[PDB]
Design a binder for this molecule. Structure first.
Ligand SMILES: Nc1nc(N)c2ncn(Cc3csc(C4CC4)n3)c2n1
Length: 167
């Protein structure tokens, strides 16, 4: 038993809700919140900009030190950093950005990072400003993630479309 509430159950291990990942995180304090990161951990907009703002820019400060030490992530890769006031940990995952021409097949590699964590609150990778089809992203999530994932979908219209079209 865990503290997530109001989710619809899609599969054995995948759950979905129309919600603000920022407010969902501050209420739940999940062990892991997933950020829709880029390779530079520049948290300027979308989910990343929202999460970073909610941390009072502490996420960005920590991320800049990470990059200065380690260099950029790979597309499809991830790193674990602090969750600040939102979660114990933040798993920064780089899905391919279609608006940069990145290969959508790396979306499966991106979701594989979730399997290193037993339970996660997450957005749909490569959705929103990353330019992928959120319905494809949901299918890849369901077919790749085996751990327990709670997906927060900000847009109510999109949430209803994801549920109604789910096979
Ligand atoms: N659940 C939730 N909460 C927010 N506050 C929010 N903002 C943008 N998106 C959609 C989204 C999913 S992946 C993504 C980035 C790759 C660009 N953007 C949001 N989803």
């Amino acid at each position: 038993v865990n503290s997530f509430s109001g989710y619809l159950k899609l599969t054995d291990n995948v759950y979905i809700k129309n919600a603000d990942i920022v407010e969902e995180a501050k209420k739940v304090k999940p062990t892991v919140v997933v950020n829709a990161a880029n390779v530079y951990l520049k948290h300027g907009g979308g989910v990343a900009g929202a999460l970073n703002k909610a941390t009072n820019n502490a996420m960005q400060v920590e991320s800049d030190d990470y990059i200065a030490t380690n260099g950029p992530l790979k597309v499809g890769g991830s790193c674990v950093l602090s969750g600040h006031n939102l979660a114990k940990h933040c798993l920064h995952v780089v899905g391919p950005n279609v608006n940069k021409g990145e290969d959508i097949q790396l979306l499966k590699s991106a979701y594989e990072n979730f399997n290193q964590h037993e339970v996660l609150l997450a957005p749909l990778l490569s959705a929103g400003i990353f330019g992928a089809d959120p319905i494809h992203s949901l299918r890849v999530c369901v077919d790749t993630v085996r751990t327990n994932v709670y997906l927060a979908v900000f847009d109510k219209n999109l949430y209803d479309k994801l549920v109604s079209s789910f096979l």
